[PDB]
Amino acid sequence: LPMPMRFRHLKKTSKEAVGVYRSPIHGRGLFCKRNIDAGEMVIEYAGIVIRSILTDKREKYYDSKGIGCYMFRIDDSEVVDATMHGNAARFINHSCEPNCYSRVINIDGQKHIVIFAMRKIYRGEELTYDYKFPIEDKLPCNCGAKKCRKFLN
Amino acid sequence: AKAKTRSSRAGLQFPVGRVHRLLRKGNYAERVGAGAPVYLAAVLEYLTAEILELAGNAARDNKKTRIIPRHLQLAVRNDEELNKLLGRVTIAQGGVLPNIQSVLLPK
Amino acid sequence: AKAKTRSSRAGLQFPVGRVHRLLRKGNYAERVGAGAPVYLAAVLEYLTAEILELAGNAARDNKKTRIIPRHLQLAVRNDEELNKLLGRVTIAQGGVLPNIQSVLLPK
Amino acid sequence: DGTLDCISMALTCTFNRWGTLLAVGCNDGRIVIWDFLTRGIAKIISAHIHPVCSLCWSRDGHKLVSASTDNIVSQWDVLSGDCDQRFRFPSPILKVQYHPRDQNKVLVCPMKSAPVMLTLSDSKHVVLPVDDDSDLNVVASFDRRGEYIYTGNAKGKILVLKTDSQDLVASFRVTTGTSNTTAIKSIEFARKGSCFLINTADRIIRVYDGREILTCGRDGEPEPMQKLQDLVNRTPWKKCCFSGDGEYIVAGSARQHALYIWEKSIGNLVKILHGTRGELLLDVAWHPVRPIIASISSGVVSIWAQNQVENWSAFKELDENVEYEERESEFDI
Amino acid sequence: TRKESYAIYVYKVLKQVHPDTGISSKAMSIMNSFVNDVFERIAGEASRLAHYNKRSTITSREIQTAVRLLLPGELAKHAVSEGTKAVTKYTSA
Amino acid sequence: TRKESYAIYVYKVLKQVHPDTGISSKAMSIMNSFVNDVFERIAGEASRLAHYNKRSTITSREIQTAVRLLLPGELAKHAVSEGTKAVTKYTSA
Amino acid sequence: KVLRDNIQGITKPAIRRLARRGGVKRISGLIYEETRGVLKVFLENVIRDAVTYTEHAKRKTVTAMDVVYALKRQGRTLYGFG
Amino acid sequence: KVLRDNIQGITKPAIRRLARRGGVKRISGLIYEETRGVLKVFLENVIRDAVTYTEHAKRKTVTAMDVVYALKRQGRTLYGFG
Amino acid sequence: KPHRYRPGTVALREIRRYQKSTELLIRKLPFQRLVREIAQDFKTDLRFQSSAVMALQEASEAYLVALFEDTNLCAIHAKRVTIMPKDIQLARRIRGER
Amino acid sequence: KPHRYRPGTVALREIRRYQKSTELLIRKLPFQRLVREIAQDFKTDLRFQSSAVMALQEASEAYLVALFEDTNLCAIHAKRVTIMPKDIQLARRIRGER
Amino acid sequence: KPNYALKFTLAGHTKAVSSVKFSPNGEWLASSSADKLIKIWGAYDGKFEKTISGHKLGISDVAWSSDSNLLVSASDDKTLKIWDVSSGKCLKTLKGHSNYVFCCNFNPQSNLIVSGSFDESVRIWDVKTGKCLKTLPAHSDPVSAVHFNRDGSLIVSSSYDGLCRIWDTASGQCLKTLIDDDNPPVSFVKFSPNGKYILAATLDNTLKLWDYSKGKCLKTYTGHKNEKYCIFANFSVTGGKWIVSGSEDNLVYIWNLQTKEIVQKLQGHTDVVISTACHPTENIIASAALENDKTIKLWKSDC
DNA sequence: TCGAGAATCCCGGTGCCGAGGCCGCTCAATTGGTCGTAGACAGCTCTAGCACCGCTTAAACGCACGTACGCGCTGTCCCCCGCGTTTTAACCGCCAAGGGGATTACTCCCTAGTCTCCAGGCACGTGTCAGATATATACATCCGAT
DNA sequence: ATCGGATGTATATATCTGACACGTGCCTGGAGACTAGGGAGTAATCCCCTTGGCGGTTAAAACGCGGGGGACAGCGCGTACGTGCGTTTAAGCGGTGCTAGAGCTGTCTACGACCAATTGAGCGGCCTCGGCACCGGGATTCTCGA
Ligand SMILES: Nc1ncnc2c1ncn2[C@@H]1O[C@H](CSCC[C@H](N)C(=O)O)[C@@H](O)[C@H]1O
Ligand SMILES: [Zn+2]
């Protein structure tokens, strides 16, 4: 399956593959509404693709509104920012033992941040991936798994 | 001057006069040779002889006097050279000679 | 008594008189319609132009001024209608157009 | 997608003039008016002792004509629940239908006899004419405005009569693919315009325009506005209907207990809603003002909604990664 | 319409080879059409041969060569022998 | 011994289509043989058809029917259009 | 009287009967329609040429002789019809 | 001067070259002689008819035109030789 | 207790009796309607001799029998008893019908 | 260290250049001697035009290429890349050459 | 500029008044308080009709059925109760809300009941069976105001989290979320008489009239005092088109509808005017104040 | 693995229409002249084919060897065969209206055939450049260690 | 999944040439003009085959329904075959030489063409009856659980 074709099939079936419910981890969480096998696309982190140089000025700007900073680093140049305009992938919870993993795949010359399945996910499971956040000096992780880093950082 | 048919002097049953007429009207040559219709009529008679012989053989083997197209089909597919002559020829009401592949047999 | 050939009177290249004489000496029918050689030569001219167009196209595609038989073979094989017309026809120095099945290419 | 357990022995269903109540025939011979918003029964009327096989709503939504299996046809008010009138005729009735613009007139398709238009004010009955007088099985229905009556026989004939005069204003014989004749299973109409549909015994549905039918007039050659069928499974349609708007056509597969929804403009299948294989699909209806579908099977009512992206979706929501057009004064002060 | 066929001659050669056997008019017409087909074959190939030799008189030699072209092996051999014998008989008188 | 051919006409139509493109002698012979073959095909078809109609005259209609029998689709379409144009120009002489 | 989609008139039992005659034991379903297609394909040629002959015959009906000539031109001649 | 067994003159590299031209990657050995056979089979027909034409031509040498006519009669005509 | 033959056995006997029998295996009227539907595509209002359409139908049937035969043989070469549409496509490809 | 290509790769390039090239692939004199040996079987002392035998050889080569092509395709249908003589026999059987 | 003068002062609720609602026939007024009781009063003369008791905690909101015969009371006991006004008997008891129900309202057909609670959930209930028909986590704060639209097809909802959320009813969709570019706690909200508009009372001394057909605020009403309590507002269409609202400065403000200018100031209350009810047919305003007043007052204008 | 059961083969018997035998009714085969001509044959060239022989060398045969596809086997799945029941429309037999198919009878416009003339085509010389050939070169791609 | 090296392949160039485009004189097929006849075109008539419809029957098709049977997947292994590298062989060029037989021209004569006169072999048409198609029933033999 071509990467653009699989991305299109994700965009078509993600809505019927992901849900948003009450999260035992943190607030509102993404849940697996139907068995998600490994390798299959779970959900794209949709949002405004800005440049990383635009993050800070936007970040400070978002500090003026106090809205949740929904930013994921595309690469060393761009960042998907979904604070005001994004998708349900904002509400995916960080997980130290993630059944999902983040990638940035190219589609016809545009990089989309897609969370794929690290393992076979099953119906009812809260869809969660690893934010890949560096070590800070500490956001506690409520994944409930076994190898929790005791924090998001 | 009594008129005997040319087939009589040729000792054949197929009408050599009709043969030569069909030749002259078929636009195959400016003029047809004298012995050419006799020759081709003899060839045709021999072919018919072989074919109907095999046909009657098959019919008697099937306990039948009347020859139906099935007998002709079976006779054609039963002889090699006849088949090769008529492989590109479909036959009406002929069906297929009974033939079953090896692997199809049970065990 | 003005001289003007039927090919000119049709504004075509193929000799209407030559093909008419050939049909006369070909023994296909007692008489021939006068416009039939014209029509036939026109069809031949059209199809010849059709084939040689693709021929010269492949030739200049190989930077070739004079067309080679390989070019004609490639031309007739690429065209669907032409190939269907000449599927049961082989060509001297024709070769075969490039054709590789899927699984032959390694992975 | 929703179901109704509070209803037992459900056989037939029909929306009111607005899509607010559902009249259900109970096999014991009762009428259950189930209400939508309260999600409960609005009324219960033990009409007769024989099952109810046909129902229809009044324009104001207050009169309900019902046909029972015992040749009985009776009218009941939605408030009083009393027998407004009760009649009996030979050749048990197959269908009753209020005149959509006159709640006095009512068409009646019986089993063997020709359909008859009655009135609930006076006990009269005008029998509709039939082409061959030997079909013995003819469906008939008023148009959307009760202006005409379409009659389909068992031999693929179609007679469009003037409901008041019962006289031929249009006619044509329908084929059965090759050239054959077929039993006209049903003549259905839409709540909008003249776009109606014909279900025949050939498992094929033909959408037509009644305006064009009148255009061809007597013995025309009209082609169907649309052609629908189970081209993959070759399934006969126990029932079919339009949508509330008329751009969607639902067909109930009792052969496999599914619901195939096509379009009208193009005719392509919108989708398919699959019910359980064990249940025998009986009746189908569309919510005239909602993309919801009610189904009746083995005495059970099932709901089939068509919901939107909402109920949580409304920050702002987008679908794909939006490349922000960096303004020329982005980094500027 | 006097339509010409070979049915009587087919019956004749039948009695010559199989005296106590019947036939079907359907199979009869089949044999007739076969006769016509092989006949037009031989005719076409003989004519084309003479054309290649630029001849205009289809004679016995052309017939024999055409049979050699069309029939495989011993079929053609026996056919050629029969044709030569019939030609010899006809020319003997 | 003068050997007739069509090479001059092939060269002519080639120049009429591709004035710059050349042609090989062997390729020219291939083209000539091809024309001979297709012409023989259509001639035999026309003759057989006229025989099926018992008409001893081969006219344009026979040619049209033959080429429609022989060429696949748009080939035959363009062919019959060109032939009709040519025969009309010939009649208007 | 306009005819349509009678290709489905070719019943699956008929196709499997033809296969049995051809000596086939087990068959997949996906064959049938393909068969139909191929059948049509075959038809799509001969019948056309048929009317073509009929066309040149200036006649309105098709003659058995015409389809015999068609199959002859298609190298699949048949016997028993003149 | 009597000739014999020159069918082995068809070298295995030649057979595999023909196969490569036909688009074949891997081949078994048992093909080669079979190939030869088939080749001969093909030959066994055409060449014979060839001399047959030459026979009717009352000539001693074989003409390219003759084999063209043979392939024509065998439905495998060839272009480029008259 | 009810009895059921092992698979194919009934089909094998069917093959035997069909190779034995010689009648047609396709219902006449549907085939004729198909022929008329195909004919109206090239020209409408074209009549047919009964013998003509019968010959059409039988020639097509025999052609299909030959196709079934060589496709089944090819499937044998494919080491399978169940034919697959790719096998028929391959056979047509070999027959020069593609 | 000496290098050796993986199997078939060289053969694949051979296929490419051969489909590209157009000359003959059989040595002339052996083929001509074979033709003479076959001819002497039907009649001795039969001469041949050089162009005649050349046309023989090239037509036979092209026929063999077609046979190789459809046999290879049949072998693909047999799920193998290596041709087997049964495949060639099957192909000939389909071509009506048996 | 109306001239609403005080005709009758209605008192007797021994605790903090929370809601007064004129009966749809204008014959009765249902004064609710934190005393677990409702008081039915003569809406034309301040005649104390009766007291309906039975609740367990303070009744935060009360609402009439669309036929003046029934009354839904949402009490701090986390329960609702539907009482027949003509008899006082508790015809229905609605249990299931896990927290303080702050708002209750009927649909235009009186067949549905919408209830927003402290549990941040809006629940739709039957009236003939009283069963909870639907439930939604509507907001992130206690829902204090819920109201059907002009026909019952849509429900506007208000909570302390500043969201003005309009929901679909036939399927429960959060259709719109009106925000005024800030987060001021919107204590009360209601549709317009024509249903095209929506009045939202925010806890910053502001009444925002949005065009619901457009989804943007059209009119602003400021100058009153509403910062903590869920002050109820009224439209005046029977007489002069006014916007009436209680206030936390013992005053009942009355602005003009179009010009949004203060056209009258009904003083006379001594405490925060907790609730206001407009007569459905007459020019009678029932203004009720909180515990330091515990009085309702009828005001009648002549313009 | 010996019976039960089921599909089949054959035998007698029934009634039928196509096969066949026979009948008037030709036109197409036969007979006989007569004539123009196809080719059969004689007899000449010359050339293309046949074979010789030498020299060069790409090309063929065989080796060793790695290796990977063919094959053989396994377990799974599904799926098509078999059979029973339910449906239907093909078929069959009949009737009927007509529209084309076939036919004959006229009528003539076109083609074959003849003769005249010349002009396009064709064998035949002749420069001449398209590409065939060869070399050095830069680019593309497999293959293996990492 | 990558880079380096080897090798194989597309490129530019030089020049050589030999097919190839071009031009000629001379021939003959093609055009032009004219005449005959009669194949083709048209018309009016009959038929009859077809196309269409109708009612009853059931054999046939559709649908469904287990379920054992094979498609197919993967996996071990090993034989058979690609391949690079050896070797040695006839393939190819070419050039010579001889002539046998194609291939040519000129007879001259037998040989169908053709037409005319004659008529019974053959063909549409009419009885007619006997192998044959069908039936039903009883014995025969395959096949699936022991
Ligand atoms: N694994 C985790 N455990 C606890 N909090 C988390 C978490 N992953 C993300 N979060 C918090 O959730 C926010 C990301 S949105 C992640 C979904 C979250 N349940 C929600 O309703 O918003 C971040 O601000 C972070 O503080
Ligand atoms: Zn974790």
CB J80 under 7 Å to nucleic chain M:
no
Strands B31-32 and B66-67 turn out to be: unpaired
Instruction: Identify the sign of the CA torsion E69, E70, E73, E78.
Output: negative
| Residues listed for chain E | 93
The two structure tokens encoding residue G78: 């048949």
Q: Sort G82 into a burial class: Cβ within 10 Å, 0-12 / 13-18 / 19+.
A: middle
I88 vs G36, G37, I62, J66, CA distance in Å? 12, 11, 16, 19
CA distance D218 to K280: 60
Q: Tell how far CA A81 is from the center of its chain.
A: 11
Give the resolution value in Å: 4.4
CA distance D165 to D149: 10
CB E22 under 7 Å to nucleic chain M:
yes
What residues of G are in contact with residue D177 (Cβ under 8 Å)?
4-6
CA distance G44 to G38: 9
Of A23, A146, A6, the C-alpha closest to A92 is A23
CA distance D280 to D302: 12
DSSP string for B30-75: SEE-SHHHHHHHHHHHHHHHHHHHHHHHHHHHTT-SEE-HHHHHHH
Give, as ranges, the nucleotides of chain L with any atom within 7 Å of a protein CB: 5-8, 18-21, 27-32, 38-40, 48-51, 59-61, 66-71, 79-84, 88-91, 99-103, 110-113, 118-123, 130-132, 142-144
Burial A41-70 (b: 16+ CB within 10 A, else e): bbbbbbbbbbbeebbeebeeebeeeeeeeb
Of J75, D110, B64, F2, the C-alpha closest to C103 is J75
CA distance F18 to F15: 5
Tokens 């289809």 belong to E58
User: Within an 8 Å CB–CB cutoff, is residue H65 touching chain F?
Assistant: no
Q: From the CA of A139, which ligand is nearest?
A: 1
| Residues listed for chain I | 98
- Confirm whether residue A141 is marked as ligand binding: yes
Task: Quote the crossing angle between the two packed helices G31-56 and I50-77, to the nearest 10°.
Answer: 140
CA distance G37 to G47: 15
Q: Which of A23, A26, A59 to mutate to test the pocket of ligand 1 (most atoms within 8 A of CB)?
A: A26
The two structure tokens encoding residue E33: 């059409």
Structural domains of chain H in order of their starting residue, each with its CATH number:
1-82 (1.10.20.10)
- Confirm whether residue A94 is marked as ligand binding: yes
Enclosing domain of residue J70: 3-98
The two structure tokens encoding residue K73: 């009371």
The DSSP code for D241 is: E
Q: Sort J79 into a burial class: Cβ within 10 Å, 0-12 / 13-18 / 19+.
A: exposed
Structural domains of chain A in order of their starting residue, each with its CATH number:
1-43+87-105+114-153 (2.170.270.10), 47-84 (no CATH)
Give, as ranges, the nucleotides of chain M with any atom within 7 Å of a protein CB: 6-9, 19-21, 27-33, 39-41, 49-53, 55, 60-64, 67-72, 80-85, 90-92, 100-105, 111-114, 118-124, 131-133, 143-144
Q: Looking at chain F, which residue has its C-alpha nearest residue H65?
A: F33
The two structure tokens encoding residue K235: 């439209």
What residues of E are in contact with residue C27 (Cβ under 8 Å)?
47, 51
CA distance J93 to D24: 68
3-state SS, one letter per residue, for chain J? CCCCCCCCHHHHHHHHHHHHCCCCCCCHHHHHHHHHHHHCCCCCCCEECHHHHHHHHHHHHHHHHHHHHHHHHHHHHCCCCEECHHHHHHHHHHCCCC
Query: Is the CB of residue D230 less than 8 Å from the CB of residue D186?
Result: no
Query: Is the CB of residue B43 less than 8 Å from the CB of residue B11?
Result: no
Task: Quote the crossing angle between the two packed helices H31-56 and H12-22, to the nearest 10°.
Answer: 90
DSSP string for I38-73: HHTTT-SS-EE-HHHHHHHHHHHHHHHHHHHHHHHH
- Across the interface, do E65 and H73 touch by the CB < 8 Å criterion? no
Of K79, K41, K72, the C-alpha closest to K58 is K79
Residues near ion ligand 2 (CB < 5 Å) are: A 95-96, 141, 143, 145, 148
What is the amino acid identity at position E86? A
Beta bridge partners of D293: D286, D304
What residues of J are in contact with residue H11 (Cβ under 8 Å)?
27, 30
- The structural domain count of chain J equals 1
| Chain H residues touching chain C at CB-CB below 8 Å | 21-23, 25, 75-81
Query: Is the CB of residue J12 less than 8 Å from the CB of residue C104?
Result: yes
Contacts of J5 (CB under 8 A, 6+ apart): none
Beta bridge partners of J42: none
CA distance A28 to A126: 10
D128 vs D122, D169, D174, E8, CA distance in Å? 18, 13, 20, 68
Instruction: Identify the sign of the CA torsion J23, J28, J34, J39.
Output: positive
Query: F35: part of which helix (H) or strand (E)?
Result: helix F25-52
Task: Report CA dihedral (J63, J64, J69, J71) to the nearest 10 degrees.
Answer: 110
Rg (CA), chain A: 15
Protein-to-nucleotide distance from the CA of B69 to the C1' of M127, whole angstroms: 27
A33: how many CB neighbours lie within 10 A of its CB? 17
- Domain residues of chain D, as ranges? 235-307
G24 vs B101, I13, I82, K22, CA distance in Å? 9, 11, 8, 87
CB E24 under 7 Å to nucleic chain L:
yes
Strands K197-202 and K206-211 turn out to be: antiparallel
A148 vs A120, A153, C6, CA distance in Å? 20, 11, 97
Q: Which of C23, C24, C25, C27 to mutate to test the interface with B (most CBs of B within 10 A)?
A: C27
G59 vs F69, G53, G56, I19, I57, CA distance in Å? 17, 9, 8, 39, 22
Which of the four CATH numbers 2.130.10.10, 3.40.50.300, 2.40.10.170, 3.90.1150.10 does domain K1-303 have? 2.130.10.10
First to last CA, chain C: 77
Method: cryo-EM
The two structure tokens encoding residue K14: 């021994």
The DSSP code for F75 is: H
Q: What value, to the nearest 5°, has the Cα angle with vertex G72 and ends G66 and G76?
A: 120
Query: D68: part of which helix (H) or strand (E)?
Result: strand D63-68
Chain D neighbours (≥3 Cβ pairs under 8 A) are A, G, I, K
Q: What value, to the nearest 5°, has the Cα angle with vertex H38 and ends H37 and H44?
A: 85
User: Helix, strand, or coil here: F40?
Assistant: helix
Ligand 1 near A83 CB (within 6 A): no
Q: What value, to the nearest 5°, has the Cα angle with vertex D128 and ends D125 and D133?
A: 125
The two structure tokens encoding residue C21: 């004489």
In angstroms, what separates the C-alpha of J62 from chain H's closest C-alpha?
A: 9
Query: Is the CB of residue D111 less than 8 Å from the CB of residue D95?
Result: no
The two structure tokens encoding residue D31: 């009428």
- Domain residues of chain K, as ranges? 1-303
Q: Looking at chain I, which residue has its C-alpha nearest residue J74?
A: I90
Query: Is the CB of residue D149 less than 8 Å from the CB of residue D158?
Result: no
User: Within an 8 Å CB–CB cutoff, is residue E47 touching chain C?
Assistant: yes
The two structure tokens encoding residue F29: 């012979």
What is the amino acid identity at position A152? L
Q: Give the nearest ligand 1 atom to A69 CA.
A: 24
Strands D281-286 and D21-26 turn out to be: unpaired
Query: Is the CB of residue D267 less than 8 Å from the CB of residue D227?
Result: yes
CA distance D182 to D159: 15
CA distance K118 to A56: 39
Contacts of A44 (CB under 8 A, 6+ apart): A7, A10, A11, A14, A87, A89, A112, A113, A114, A115, D320, D321
D238: how many CB neighbours lie within 10 A of its CB? 20
H41: how many CB neighbours lie within 10 A of its CB? 12
Q: Looking at chain C, which residue has its C-alpha nearest residue F66?
A: C40
Structural domains of chain F in order of their starting residue, each with its CATH number:
1-92 (1.10.20.10)
- The structural domain count of chain C equals 1
CA distance J40 to J30: 15
Rg (CA), chain G: 16
The two structure tokens encoding residue C24: 């006369």
What residues of H are in contact with residue C95 (Cβ under 8 Å)?
21
Query: Is the CB of residue D87 less than 8 Å from the CB of residue D123?
Result: yes
Q: Sort A142 into a burial class: Cβ within 10 Å, 0-12 / 13-18 / 19+.
A: middle
D177: how many CB neighbours lie within 10 A of its CB? 18
CA distance I93 to G27: 20
Greatest alpha-carbon pair distance for chain H in Å reads 47
CA distance I70 to I81: 13
Q: What is the CATH number of the domain that holds I30?
A: 1.10.20.10
Q: Which of F3, F4, F23, F33 to mutate to test the interface with H (most CBs of H within 10 A)?
A: F33
Q: Looking at chain F, which residue has its C-alpha nearest residue H69?
A: F37
